[PDB]
Design a protein around this ligand. Structure first.
Ligand SMILES: O=c1cc(-c2ccccc2)oc2cc(O)c(O)c(O)c12
Lengths: 298, 296
């Protein structure tokens, strides 16, 4: 009844191409006359903490990159490195280029991922940027260069390009300027992310979504202080709630009729006692990948 | 890393339009020179208690249906009824019509929904045809005509068109021939879905997925016949397992080394004793197919 939804992916699907350098093939994003892809496509198996990407790329030519848009092949007439991305300039300008921008999303925010393989889209799902700057996504081999995005109006805000899977199985990538999210580097060495936490602002948004959907069982008559709640949050590996967070939830406090500090009391009770086998909005776990904005849209 | 994934929606977005008739607008599906939409578009709020569609349809002309594909308007050149669907022959053939079929989805199978409002795609989600022929979808006021679909290769198998919410909160609709899923009718009436049952095939697939992910407390060394398993399942309102279901679980069984009937013996104990968490939750997921699982 209330479920994760992904943006319609059509404006992105039209931008997906396949980029091959040597014996390596991944996905790239074709916008106007530029193709973006992860730079480790030049990289053989010297990915193993060896890569000097400046050295590997100086030895390449436009000729060494093969880019296919569906059936058609596009001629690479230029190339450059932007952080951990390749910028391939091509002769044809994507007729399907949408209105778009590049944005760097902040932890806790959500976006849709179009999981791609050899340049053909295969799946779409919603997810979130974790506090430790990883995403708990679904990426197989060949998904590299898949992009994450939000759509507002006719405009596509790209926020993520996929680069690698970490040992723990979470995923790491960059924005569309090629700067990584988090402490990661694009080399096949072992890398740990920071210890993750739970997105408090999103759980509270979700609890509001349950109230707005006719699920009030977890509420109570109590209340707590911002700091008094925050003390419970730390004991449970939850992100401290900022005063601004409260201000973000204002509109939802209104429609629900529950004061933000009251919902914290409810949440504090849920964390301490558990859920006793009941469910909220259909889930038996405190759900932290809907934003206030997401809940408003449904 | 197990998430519900929807198919890419773009091959379907290219086909969504806006049908208006009177003061009622909903969504329509535009393939070639025909536009498909729910026939209840021609009803008034009054004529919703016991409508005679053939009557209401005879009392309408081409010029009675407004079909808008974005800013452009399409001209209705013809119109007929196909069961619970209106077929509007249109001015133009859709330049963006993909390779497609009309398939009839079986209970337990899944599909992607493109939730549209005013012909404008809003969002994509995945869901399953429940055994009681409803779906637990996400459809607000204005979603009728939104379409459900699967993609295999470059081809869109259309399988659902949305028509109604039932008082349960769940949703009912037709295939793209206009034949409803279930016993439901496009009249405001006292219809309601039957008792739902759990899709046992998908729960068994979920258990294989959890085993693959390192969760395996629920296994046991007991065994069960198909027949003794099916008898227990039905007492708990789980679908009985068919011969074909057992085969569809073949790949997952071998990948795990857990024989199908051994996983059934584990599910049997969970049904009779309860749970403890599986893949993070205490309720068994039943909308993840065996196919969803093998993809990872
Ligand atoms: O997960 C991936 C990781 C890497 C990689 C290479 C060097 C250092 C770190 C990661 O390359 C890839 C290339 C692909 O075509 C693909 O589908 C992938 O999933 C990966």
């Amino acid at each position: 009844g209330f479920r994760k939804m992904a943006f319609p992916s059509g404006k992105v699907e039209g931008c997906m191409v396949q980029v091959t350098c040597g014996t390596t093939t991944l996905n790239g994003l074709w916008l106007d006359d530029t193709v973006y892809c992860p730079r480790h496509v030049i990289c053989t198996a010297e990915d193993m903490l060896n890569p000097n990407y400046e050295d590997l790329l100086i030895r390449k030519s436009n000729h060494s990159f093969l880019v296919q848009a569906g059936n058609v092949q596009l001629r690479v007439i230029g190339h450059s490195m932007q952080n951990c991305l390749l910028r391939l300039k091509v002769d044809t300008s994507n007729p399907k280029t949408p209105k778009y921008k590049f944005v760097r999303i902040q932890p806790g925010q959500t976006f849709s991922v179009l999981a791609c393989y050899n340049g053909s889209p295969s799946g779409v799902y919603q997810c979130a940027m974790r506090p430790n700057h990883t995403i708990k996504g679904s990426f197989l081999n060949g998904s590299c260069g898949s992009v994450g995005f939000n759509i507002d109006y006719d405009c596509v805000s790209f926020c993520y390009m996929h680069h690698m899977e970490l040992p723990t199985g979470v995923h790491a990538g960059t924005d569309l300027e090629g700067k990584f999210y988090g402490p990661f580097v694009d080399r096949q060495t072992a890398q740990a992310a920071g210890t993750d936490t739970t997105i408090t602002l999103n759980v509270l948004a979700w609890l509001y979504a349950a109230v707005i959907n006719g699920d009030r069982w977890f509420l109570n008559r109590f209340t707590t202080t911002l700091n008094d709640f925050n003390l419970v949050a730390m004991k449970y590996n939850y992100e401290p709630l900022t005063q601004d967070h409260v201000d973000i939830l204002g509109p939802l406090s209104a429609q629900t009729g529950i004061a933000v500090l009251d919902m914290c009391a409810a949440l504090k009770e849920l964390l301490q006692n558990g859920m006793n086998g009941r469910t909220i909005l259909g889930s038996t776990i405190l759900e932290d990948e809907f934003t206030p904005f997401d809940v408003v849209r449904q």
